[PDB]
Amino acid sequence: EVETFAFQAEIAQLMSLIINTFYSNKEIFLRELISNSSDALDKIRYESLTDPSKLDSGKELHINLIPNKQDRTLTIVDTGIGMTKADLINNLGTIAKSGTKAFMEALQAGADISMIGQFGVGFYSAYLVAEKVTVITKHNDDEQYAWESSAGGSFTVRTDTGEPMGRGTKVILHLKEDQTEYLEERRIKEIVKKHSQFIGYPITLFVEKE
Numbered sequence: 001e002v003e004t005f006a007f008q009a010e011i012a013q014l015m016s017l018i019i020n021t022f023y024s025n026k027e028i029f030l031r032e033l034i035s036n037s038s039d040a041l042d043k044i045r046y047e048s049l050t051d052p053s054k055l056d057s058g059k060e061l062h063i064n065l066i067p068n069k070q071d072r073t074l075t076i077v078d079t080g081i082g083m084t085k086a087d088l089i090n091n092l093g094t095i096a097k098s099g100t101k102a103f104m105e106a107l108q109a110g111a112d113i114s115m116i117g118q119f120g121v122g123f124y125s126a127y128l129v130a131e132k133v134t135v136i137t138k139h140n141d142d143e144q145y146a147w148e149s150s151a152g153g154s155f156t157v158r159t160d161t162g163e164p165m166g167r168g169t170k171v172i173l174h175l176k177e178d179q180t181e182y183l184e185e186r187r188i189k190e191i192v193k194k195h196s197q198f199i200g201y202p203i204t205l206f207v208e209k210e
């Protein structure tokens, strides 16, 4: 039961720019995803103040970074608010439209790709290092879904029958062949310390079994 959707033309152009532009400072993708995780965790924490049952799906508010050399994936997991099917398919891409236009304008005026987060479209920076991105998400008001895209103007959404998450979002980065440094413990620690040292949630960098 896999549905295929076209990105809005502005998002497809943003993704092509990220993939095509020569830009060496790719490490910023991690700061952007951790920032998105922190925002989602802030959202559930805020909502839980007026409705404590919103934490019945899990009280722990944290971020896990999980590298896997065998699958060549780097996963960023949070126990934030999560996304409904409507968030995944339409609402978040609608918001992203204006941010995309402002960003592309800022770039033509002298800005650089690392400033993507100032335009609210930081998730797409995942395409600096990933040939494919899989997003597993679970919001309190909906079922678990798997979103996926290798760019090229489309994405898919399916209900996810994999390991249940409770609540939150898991961004799985299927890394490009030449971007395996992002699976290295020393490299991830360096990036987190440089760009994400003040995030208000524990960040656990998992290590590899082999």
Ligand SMILES: Cc1ccc(S(=O)(=O)c2cc(C)nc(N)n2)cc1
Pocket: 036, 037, 040, 078, 080, 081, 082, 083, 087, 088, 092, 122, 123, 135, 147, 169
């Ligand atoms: C496919 C997709 C849509 C939106 C996002 S996001 O950056 O807006 C976001 C939203 C939430 C609730 N959590 C996280 N981590 N990230 C990420 C990936």
